[PDB]
Design a binder for this molecule. Sequence first.
Ligand SMILES: *[C@@H]1O[C@H](CO)[C@@H](O[C@@H]2O[C@H](CO)[C@@H](O[C@@H]3O[C@H](CO[C@H]4O[C@H](CO)[C@@H](O)[C@H](O)[C@@H]4O)[C@@H](O)[C@H](O[C@H]4O[C@H](CO)[C@@H](O)[C@H](O)[C@@H]4O)[C@@H]3O)[C@H](O)[C@H]2NC(C)=O)[C@H](O)[C@H]1NC(C)=O
Ligand SMILES: *[C@@H]1O[C@H](CO)[C@@H](O[C@@H]2O[C@H](CO)[C@@H](O[C@@H]3O[C@H](CO[C@H]4O[C@H](CO)[C@@H](O)[C@H](O)[C@@H]4O)[C@@H](O)[C@H](O[C@H]4O[C@H](CO)[C@@H](O)[C@H](O)[C@@H]4O)[C@@H]3O)[C@H](O)[C@H]2NC(C)=O)[C@H](O)[C@H]1NC(C)=O
Ligand SMILES: *[C@@H]1O[C@H](CO)[C@@H](O[C@@H]2O[C@H](CO)[C@@H](O[C@@H]3O[C@H](CO[C@H]4O[C@H](CO)[C@@H](O)[C@H](O)[C@@H]4O)[C@@H](O)[C@H](O[C@H]4O[C@H](CO)[C@@H](O)[C@H](O)[C@@H]4O)[C@@H]3O)[C@H](O)[C@H]2NC(C)=O)[C@H](O)[C@H]1NC(C)=O
Ligand SMILES: *[C@@H]1O[C@H](CO)[C@@H](O[C@@H]2O[C@H](CO)[C@@H](O[C@@H]3O[C@H](CO)[C@@H](O)[C@H](O[C@H]4O[C@H](CO)[C@@H](O)[C@H](O)[C@@H]4O)[C@@H]3O)[C@H](O)[C@H]2NC(C)=O)[C@H](O)[C@H]1NC(C)=O
Ligand SMILES: *[C@@H]1O[C@H](CO)[C@@H](O[C@@H]2O[C@H](CO)[C@@H](O[C@@H]3O[C@H](CO)[C@@H](O)[C@H](O)[C@@H]3O)[C@H](O)[C@H]2NC(C)=O)[C@H](O)[C@H]1NC(C)=O
Ligand SMILES: *[C@@H]1O[C@H](CO)[C@@H](O[C@@H]2O[C@H](CO)[C@@H](O[C@@H]3O[C@H](CO)[C@@H](O)[C@H](O)[C@@H]3O)[C@H](O)[C@H]2NC(C)=O)[C@H](O)[C@H]1NC(C)=O
Ligand SMILES: Cc1cc(-c2[nH]c3ccc(C4CCNCC4)cc3c2C(C)C)cc(C)n1
Ligand SMILES: Cc1cc(-c2[nH]c3ccc(C4CCNCC4)cc3c2C(C)C)cc(C)n1
Ligand SMILES: *[C@@H]1O[C@H](CO)[C@@H](O)[C@H](O)[C@H]1NC(C)=O
Ligand SMILES: *[C@@H]1O[C@H](CO)[C@@H](O)[C@H](O)[C@H]1NC(C)=O
Ligand SMILES: *[C@@H]1O[C@H](CO)[C@@H](O)[C@H](O)[C@H]1NC(C)=O
Ligand SMILES: *[C@@H]1O[C@H](CO)[C@@H](O)[C@H](O)[C@H]1NC(C)=O
Ligand SMILES: *[C@@H]1O[C@H](CO)[C@@H](O)[C@H](O)[C@H]1NC(C)=O
Ligand SMILES: *[C@@H]1O[C@H](CO)[C@@H](O)[C@H](O)[C@H]1NC(C)=O
Ligand SMILES: *[C@@H]1O[C@H](CO)[C@@H](O)[C@H](O)[C@H]1NC(C)=O
Ligand SMILES: *[C@@H]1O[C@H](CO)[C@@H](O)[C@H](O)[C@H]1NC(C)=O
Ligand SMILES: *[C@@H]1O[C@H](CO)[C@@H](O)[C@H](O)[C@H]1NC(C)=O
Ligand SMILES: *[C@@H]1O[C@H](CO)[C@@H](O)[C@H](O)[C@H]1NC(C)=O
Ligand SMILES: *[C@@H]1O[C@H](CO)[C@@H](O)[C@H](O)[C@H]1NC(C)=O
Ligand SMILES: *[C@@H]1O[C@H](CO)[C@@H](O)[C@H](O)[C@H]1NC(C)=O
Ligand SMILES: *[C@@H]1O[C@H](CO)[C@@H](O)[C@H](O)[C@H]1NC(C)=O
Ligand SMILES: *[C@@H]1O[C@H](CO)[C@@H](O)[C@H](O)[C@H]1NC(C)=O
Lengths: 737, 737
Amino acid sequence: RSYPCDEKVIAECSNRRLQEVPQTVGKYVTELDLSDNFITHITNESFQGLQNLTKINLNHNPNGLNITDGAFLNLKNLRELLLEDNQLPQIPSGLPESLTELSLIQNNIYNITKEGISRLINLKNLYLAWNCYFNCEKTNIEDGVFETLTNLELLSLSFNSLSHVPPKLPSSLRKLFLSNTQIKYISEEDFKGLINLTLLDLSGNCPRCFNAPFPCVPCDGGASINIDRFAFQNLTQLRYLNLSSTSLRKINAAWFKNMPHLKVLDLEFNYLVGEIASGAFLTMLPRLEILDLSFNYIKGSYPQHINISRNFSKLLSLRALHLRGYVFQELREDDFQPLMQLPNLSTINLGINFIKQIDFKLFQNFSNLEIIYLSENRISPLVKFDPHSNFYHFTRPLIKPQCAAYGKALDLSLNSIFFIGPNQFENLPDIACLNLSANSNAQVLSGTEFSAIPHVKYLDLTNNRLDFDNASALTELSDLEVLDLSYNSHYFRIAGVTHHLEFIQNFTNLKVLNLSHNNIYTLTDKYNLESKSLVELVFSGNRLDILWNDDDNRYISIFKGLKNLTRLDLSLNRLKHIPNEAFLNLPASLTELHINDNMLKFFNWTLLQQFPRLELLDLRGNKLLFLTDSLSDFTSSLRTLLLSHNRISHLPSGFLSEVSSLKHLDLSSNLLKTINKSALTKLSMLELHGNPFECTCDIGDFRRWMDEHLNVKIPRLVDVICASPGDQRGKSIVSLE
Amino acid sequence: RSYPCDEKVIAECSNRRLQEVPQTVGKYVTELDLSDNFITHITNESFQGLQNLTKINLNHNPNGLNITDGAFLNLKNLRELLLEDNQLPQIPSGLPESLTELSLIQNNIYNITKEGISRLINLKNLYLAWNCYFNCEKTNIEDGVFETLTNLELLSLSFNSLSHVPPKLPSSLRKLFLSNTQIKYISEEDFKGLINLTLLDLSGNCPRCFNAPFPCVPCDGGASINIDRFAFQNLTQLRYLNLSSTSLRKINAAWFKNMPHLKVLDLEFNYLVGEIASGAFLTMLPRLEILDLSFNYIKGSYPQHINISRNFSKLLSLRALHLRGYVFQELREDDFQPLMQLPNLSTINLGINFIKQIDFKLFQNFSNLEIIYLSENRISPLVKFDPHSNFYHFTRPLIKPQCAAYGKALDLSLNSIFFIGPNQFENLPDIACLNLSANSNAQVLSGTEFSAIPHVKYLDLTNNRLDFDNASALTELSDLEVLDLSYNSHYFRIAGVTHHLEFIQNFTNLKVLNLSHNNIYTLTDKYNLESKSLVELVFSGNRLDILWNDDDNRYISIFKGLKNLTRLDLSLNRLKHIPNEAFLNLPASLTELHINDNMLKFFNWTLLQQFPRLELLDLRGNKLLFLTDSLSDFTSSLRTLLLSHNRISHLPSGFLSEVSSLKHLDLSSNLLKTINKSALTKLSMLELHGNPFECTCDIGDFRRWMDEHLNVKIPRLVDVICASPGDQRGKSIVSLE
Ligand SMILES: *[C@@H]1O[C@H](CO)[C@@H](O[C@@H]2O[C@H](CO)[C@@H](O[C@@H]3O[C@H](CO[C@H]4O[C@H](CO)[C@@H](O)[C@H](O)[C@@H]4O)[C@@H](O)[C@H](O[C@H]4O[C@H](CO)[C@@H](O)[C@H](O)[C@@H]4O)[C@@H]3O)[C@H](O)[C@H]2NC(C)=O)[C@H](O)[C@H]1NC(C)=O
Ligand SMILES: *[C@@H]1O[C@H](CO)[C@@H](O[C@@H]2O[C@H](CO)[C@@H](O[C@@H]3O[C@H](CO[C@H]4O[C@H](CO)[C@@H](O)[C@H](O)[C@@H]4O)[C@@H](O)[C@H](O[C@H]4O[C@H](CO)[C@@H](O)[C@H](O)[C@@H]4O)[C@@H]3O)[C@H](O)[C@H]2NC(C)=O)[C@H](O)[C@H]1NC(C)=O
Ligand SMILES: *[C@@H]1O[C@H](CO)[C@@H](O[C@@H]2O[C@H](CO)[C@@H](O[C@@H]3O[C@H](CO[C@H]4O[C@H](CO)[C@@H](O)[C@H](O)[C@@H]4O)[C@@H](O)[C@H](O[C@H]4O[C@H](CO)[C@@H](O)[C@H](O)[C@@H]4O)[C@@H]3O)[C@H](O)[C@H]2NC(C)=O)[C@H](O)[C@H]1NC(C)=O
Ligand SMILES: *[C@@H]1O[C@H](CO)[C@@H](O[C@@H]2O[C@H](CO)[C@@H](O[C@@H]3O[C@H](CO)[C@@H](O)[C@H](O[C@H]4O[C@H](CO)[C@@H](O)[C@H](O)[C@@H]4O)[C@@H]3O)[C@H](O)[C@H]2NC(C)=O)[C@H](O)[C@H]1NC(C)=O
Ligand SMILES: *[C@@H]1O[C@H](CO)[C@@H](O[C@@H]2O[C@H](CO)[C@@H](O[C@@H]3O[C@H](CO)[C@@H](O)[C@H](O)[C@@H]3O)[C@H](O)[C@H]2NC(C)=O)[C@H](O)[C@H]1NC(C)=O
Ligand SMILES: *[C@@H]1O[C@H](CO)[C@@H](O[C@@H]2O[C@H](CO)[C@@H](O[C@@H]3O[C@H](CO)[C@@H](O)[C@H](O)[C@@H]3O)[C@H](O)[C@H]2NC(C)=O)[C@H](O)[C@H]1NC(C)=O
Ligand SMILES: Cc1cc(-c2[nH]c3ccc(C4CCNCC4)cc3c2C(C)C)cc(C)n1
Ligand SMILES: Cc1cc(-c2[nH]c3ccc(C4CCNCC4)cc3c2C(C)C)cc(C)n1
Ligand SMILES: *[C@@H]1O[C@H](CO)[C@@H](O)[C@H](O)[C@H]1NC(C)=O
Ligand SMILES: *[C@@H]1O[C@H](CO)[C@@H](O)[C@H](O)[C@H]1NC(C)=O
Ligand SMILES: *[C@@H]1O[C@H](CO)[C@@H](O)[C@H](O)[C@H]1NC(C)=O
Ligand SMILES: *[C@@H]1O[C@H](CO)[C@@H](O)[C@H](O)[C@H]1NC(C)=O
Ligand SMILES: *[C@@H]1O[C@H](CO)[C@@H](O)[C@H](O)[C@H]1NC(C)=O
Ligand SMILES: *[C@@H]1O[C@H](CO)[C@@H](O)[C@H](O)[C@H]1NC(C)=O
Ligand SMILES: *[C@@H]1O[C@H](CO)[C@@H](O)[C@H](O)[C@H]1NC(C)=O
Ligand SMILES: *[C@@H]1O[C@H](CO)[C@@H](O)[C@H](O)[C@H]1NC(C)=O
Ligand SMILES: *[C@@H]1O[C@H](CO)[C@@H](O)[C@H](O)[C@H]1NC(C)=O
Ligand SMILES: *[C@@H]1O[C@H](CO)[C@@H](O)[C@H](O)[C@H]1NC(C)=O
Ligand SMILES: *[C@@H]1O[C@H](CO)[C@@H](O)[C@H](O)[C@H]1NC(C)=O
Ligand SMILES: *[C@@H]1O[C@H](CO)[C@@H](O)[C@H](O)[C@H]1NC(C)=O
Ligand SMILES: *[C@@H]1O[C@H](CO)[C@@H](O)[C@H](O)[C@H]1NC(C)=O
Ligand SMILES: *[C@@H]1O[C@H](CO)[C@@H](O)[C@H](O)[C@H]1NC(C)=O
């Protein structure tokens, strides 16, 4: 059995509290990840007899790291070497020339000398970020240090006190990163011989200090980055340009004269309100797809409308427009006239703009609109950290891909819609995906509210105060497949009416329903509970304990009518015990059942006979004390059984040698002391970490079983620690002799 | 020493896990509180030799309670008897006739018979609430059961299935409570002989269901409470009338014809929008002081303005007007014209109305306005449970009394003020108290924002995103005494500027400052830190650990400048150790010092010599392991010393016999095993509960000290449990022989 690393050939050996490099690693290993360990020393004997290695990860070691000269030199096949967050005072000496990837981020490297990297001619990707950052005083770049690296495609020098663009850069460069490098002025000679440059990042130089995870210092006298007219004169191949947080007031149109392939342009966190109103540079970008002009607002300025230049109609290739934090009161049809002529424009981002009123008729004017993002605005009822991240642009999808896949998406979440008005969805396009999350919506749903958009397939109504007790609630949305009513708190509770879940029956296509954290302790559905389409139900964070503890036993067949249900989540329901009759009434069509994070003192395993389709049973975070011995007689379909964070002290005799269908069995964080031969198949995984094991002679039977059943993978063996005796405490069960 | 009760003559014996009534109670005791105990049986021998008792509290027993016939009959001086939440099936038989107060709330009493209460002629206050509630089917009231009780002033029958008003009620009645009693119709004969009635509560009968902590069922066909024109024709002495949640659409003015003393009128949770627009009943209330018409809104109706009847000018005695949940878009000067002529109107409650715009010039039109409550509205930047509770009306003060005491109060909390506009406080009265809490205000304070109201003495700016790095921040408010910047998260952090607390110096009257949970780990104030007015600083939930762990020791005199400081809160600062030099730099003028809920491993008691005014030292929730023996040489002013929730295993020899000024010493929830004679004055209190005491022969020395020092009060002796041996485990240290 592979110890302490997990073989897959890639060997995962990260976060295992290793004080030194393990010599128990196989010679056949090509990739070794030793990150997040307490390793302090690296020598030539650390990777002895490992010529087959290509990738070595030694990040965040310890919790600095001492590396001898030519410690990696013996490895002729080493191509990737990650040495991030190691507190290295300089570049490691005698590095192998075979390297193509090198990452030296978050170290104390203040000098980029020829003695360290000039020998490495095979380097393709080089990362030297967060080295001389707020310590430093200036990063010493040796004259023509990168000139010898003629095969360098990517060079990241971001987050370093540079002041000036490094001279004598290789012509092979395709991606250049110089973010937060204190470079105030850019000249024509800075990017002269870079004919193959596709990416240029100059963000955070003379910045507009906002919500940043890193220290921000703006330039003296509110100064902007000074870029010469002829600075980007020979960057014909540039596709990506990042000029975020550069305190720009004006954009010279001449910068894009010899730039006809520009695909992405980042201009967020600048002072360009005037440039948005009249932009000459907009006629210079016919191949631009993504444009970000976010958080460009004037401090204390709340205008009536957004001033969009007519030159926005010249952006023929535009697919995405990000106009967050412009801050304006009203959006009219006339204001967005230049964008209406754009054929590829599918995404509009108007989040965090505090817009009070929008003339929603303007969105059906667009040719190919797919995403309308209006989150964190003020629309009211209408009546009659990691360094390898994009810090200034949001990479996360604006709408959940599950929602957006159905069709036209509209996000009206975190607004002032405290009730759905009769003209709320007036003159709106054919929306298939709608988000009305955290609007504090206290609407009594009757089946008249969503009449204007009756083709919604995915509806997010989370964190509201909605009333869906009426049988005709949401019935106007016949094509509805997904309904998310998570964290909904009833504001007009009626005894003998709340909760009335009769509305779900009327839907012919509703497959996914989530009424989690709704605080359902009362049901009034006289007849239970039919839905021939529903496959997934999330009933987590409710009060099933109250419902099933009922003296009259009224809610005994609460989910019996859902004869198509495959997944059921009953977690966080404060369940101490499930009545035998109530469990038998659960749909026999279930494949996945979650009863985790409850207070279950006991569980009737015999009742599993009425569930012949059950493959997954989640019983984690409960108060279960014992297990069954005759599990084979109750189940023959169960594949995954999660019993972690329980009070199981003994494994019954003939448990593993009963269930033939079982593959994954989690018994971690329990009260197991020993595993016997009698208790000891198609099992592929067995979790046992965080158990108080007695490392004596009684554990010997289970150790022999581990060597006899090598295929049964036991994860994180280092966390399978002995509780007693004192001399064996701390050590792993596999480390015994 | 009094055990298990604490003598004060009133004997507190509540929540002490008592399975039976203690016989160790003194005969001199007049008041005994045995509530929240596990007592199951009550007999005539339970209170034997206690003739001096007047008040007995047996509430929430157990966690029902079995009482024998005439168990209390032997007590001739018993006047008050509380028997709440005891699961009593009927009224206790053979109760003493001497009783004046009786509470039988939250029991299973379904019958009010003559055999139980008719003998009790001395009864003044009777409470029979939550007895026949949602079980029941109807509460059986015997004909003329209350008729014999000719001395009854208060009768509460609230939360019981009554259906009809009980006939033959005593003429002595001053307060009648009939809330949520299923009484749909009120006739002239219901309150005929009640000439001395001052209070009538009929709330929750035919209700408008809302966020109620109790079950709510509205009347059939949206029915309102039917009150006869002459139903209140003889209630001339009525001062308080509660008609909340009665689904009223119209108020008959005839109900107040013979009611000239009505002081308070509750009409919340009804459908009286039309009545507010035109109310004939308003001319019938000249002596009315408090009027509540909250949550009267029309469902789905968001009107442009509030329609206030001109008859509101006839409410000459009005002091408070509560108009929450009316729901309207804009408030104009003309809309509040009838209220402007009212001389006593001091409080206006317009909370939860979603008002987008208010013409703030209308508030200076009022004669004696003191409280302007506009919380939970939509004002944006202006540019160029217990049964004895009032369930329908808010009893809590609208503005904190400490704020309101300074003068005219304005509450604009939980609104849309994301920045302070130039016309935000345009045409506003002389405000001395302002609340701008939870507005998500990201304003860069410069000293121009609060220009229109420069007489603010108390300013609440909690839960915002404010920037106060500018030295001229809030300096326009020269008379400012209290500034609350709690939970403020800086949205625009600048390295070398954030945090800059230079603004505090300019204030000549700032006494109290609260910058708690501001996450202050960086300071840039080149010179520390003068303020000759500040007496209290709350620096809790910050990062003093980072500030004092500084390699250059820049923030060593962080609070030295505040030469008037008496109270300093340094809790939740993640402090593991305080540097000796940094502690000496704290103000000598201090009287109260809180360093609680930190991670302090050690504390230098010697440094207390530079603090001759220190009376209170809070060191709770820390990791302190040992104490000093020569405390007398370091302090002679210390009165209170809180050391609870620490790791103190030993009390040094000559600790109590050193500090003569010490009165209160808390050593609870520690690791103390025994207290010696050598370690064993003006001490009045000594806390030691939750300590692992070794109840052997070594504890005997401390037990003798307890009997010798009876004046040194040890609270909750039942919680001072032995850890070892097994036979003594669970028992109290005072229970040993
Ligand atoms: C200024 O603006 C520029 C341009 O917008 C930004 O540049 C981007 O920066 C991000 C973050 O550093 C880059 O993202 C990284 O891309 C790597 C390559 O992935 C591409 O190629 C593979 C195939 O080889 C595709 O599968 C994939 O879809 C991509 O097309 C990834 O390897 C990186 O992944 C990392 O994160 C993930 C998720 O956490 C981990 O699982 C990985 O292990 C890994 O650590 C990452 O996604 C992006 O490529 C850059 N743009 C371009 C065009 O190259 C600047 O960041 C921005 N500056 C600032 C300061 O904001
Ligand atoms: C209310 O309840 C609903 C229903 O449960 C919730 O919606 C589901 O949320 C889960 C996440 O919690 C979604 O599942 C995730 O989908 C990701 C994307 O799936 C597509 O892409 C992958 C490839 O990347 C394909 O294999 C797949 O077939 C899909 O086409 C997956 O990447 C996620 O997988 C990862 O996490 C899971 C654990 O969650 C691991 O088991 C995986 O190994 C993997 O690491 C994941 O499956 C799900 O799609 C959502 N469903 C719907 C209909 O939206 C709501 O979120 C919930 N609401 C609230 C507020 O709680
Ligand atoms: C930011 O920081 C400030 C300053 O610390 C906080 O404001 C103070 O908050 C405390 C409570 O946390 C307030 O103290 C309370 O005052 C009440 C009223 O006292 C006045 O009236 C009595 C007579 O009724 C006078 O004797 C007294 O001198 C005052 O004039 C008291 O009733 C309270 O007592 C309760 O607590 C004590 C223990 O502290 C118990 O012994 C009592 O039995 C009782 O239960 C209490 O003393 C204080 O007045 C506030 N000051 C100001 C200026 O507002 C802010 O709350 C804080 N902000 C946030 C968001 O945390
Ligand atoms: C409807 O609108 C609401 C509100 O706008 C929206 O809720 C938001 O959902 C997102 C996505 O689920 C939440 O963001 C997440 O935040 C957690 C931390 O709290 C992160 O872990 C998430 O992922 C990050 O980390 C991953 C790596 O582990 C990355 O791969 C990934 O790119 C992320 O960086 C994620 O960011 C967000 O917190 C909520 N907001 C609120 C207010 O609830 C909801 O999802 C919308 N629904 C639909 C159908 O669009
Ligand atoms: C309907 O309105 C009336 C009048 O406003 C409400 O009466 C008030 O009820 C509360 C709680 O029962 C009383 O307060 C209690 O007073 C005692 C004695 O002072 C005190 O010991 C308690 O701690 C508590 O403060 C209050 O006195 C009483 N008002 C009057 C003038 O008697 C009634 O509660 C309302 N009904 C509902 C269901 O909301
Ligand atoms: C300024 O406005 C805010 C927001 O309304 C005020 O905060 C509110 O403070 C009160 C207590 O003073 C909290 O209400 C209740 O407190 C009782 C305990 O006294 C508790 O039992 C209730 O459950 C409830 O919490 C209220 O939650 C709190 N609101 C927020 C958002 O924090 C603030 O006190 C006002 N300041 C001044 C100076 O008036
Ligand atoms: C001086 C000034 C401040 C702001 C201002 N105040 C805010 C309050 C909250 C938030 C977000 C809202 C959603 N959740 C996270 C925080 C954003 C802002 C902004 C802008 C858009 C950055 C706007 C203007 C015009 N002037
Ligand atoms: C159908 C309908 C619903 C509402 C409606 N929506 C709300 C959302 C939140 C809150 C509060 C706000 C502060 N925090 C606690 C909850 C109150 C309301 C109300 C009223 C006043 C009850 C209003 C009208 C006219 N029609
Ligand atoms: C690094 O290791 C070498 C091993 O020869 C040792 O001589 C040197 O002192 C070590 N340096 C540090 C900083 O640990
Ligand atoms: C770009 O470089 C080429 C090669 O030296 C040259 O012909 C061309 O004139 C340069 N562009 C500009 C605008 O100077
Ligand atoms: C984007 O627009 C161009 C015309 O400007 C068009 O040729 C191209 O096909 C569009 N892209 C897509 C993905 O359709
Ligand atoms: C927007 O739509 C309206 C109505 O169809 C039309 O009159 C107007 O010309 C459109 N404008 C643009 C630029 O799409
Ligand atoms: C349920 O919705 C329908 C449709 O609007 C409405 O007629 C009916 O009155 C609603 N039910 C209740 C109880 O209000
Ligand atoms: C769920 O219902 C659909 C029809 O709406 C059906 O195709 C599917 O097979 C059903 N699932 C099960 C497991 O019966
Ligand atoms: C399981 O439930 C059945 C009834 O459905 C009952 O006969 C059996 O005794 C139960 N077993 C346990 C362990 O409670
Ligand atoms: C109450 O106590 C008496 C004591 O004489 C006993 O006879 C009776 O059975 C008890 N009843 C209950 C319900 O505990
Ligand atoms: C009730 O009021 C009427 C009219 O004022 C009066 O005639 C009658 O005597 C009153 N009854 C009592 C009991 O006061
Ligand atoms: C309330 O108003 C009346 C006149 O309607 C007046 O006589 C009385 O003094 C006022 N109350 C107070 C407390 O001033
Ligand atoms: C309100 O104040 C304005 C301006 O002083 C005045 O013209 C108007 O008559 C006032 N109205 C009332 C009813 O107080
Ligand atoms: C500080 O406030 C003053 C007064 O408005 C302003 O002139 C000054 O520019 C502010 N400081 C900064 C750094 O903006
Ligand atoms: C503040 O300190 C000065 C020092 O001269 C003193 O005169 C003044 O009384 C103090 N004020 C308060 C409120 O303690
Ligand atoms: C307390 O601090 C002083 C210096 O101010 C030092 O001499 C003394 O040793 C310290 N005592 C402890 C217990 O650290």
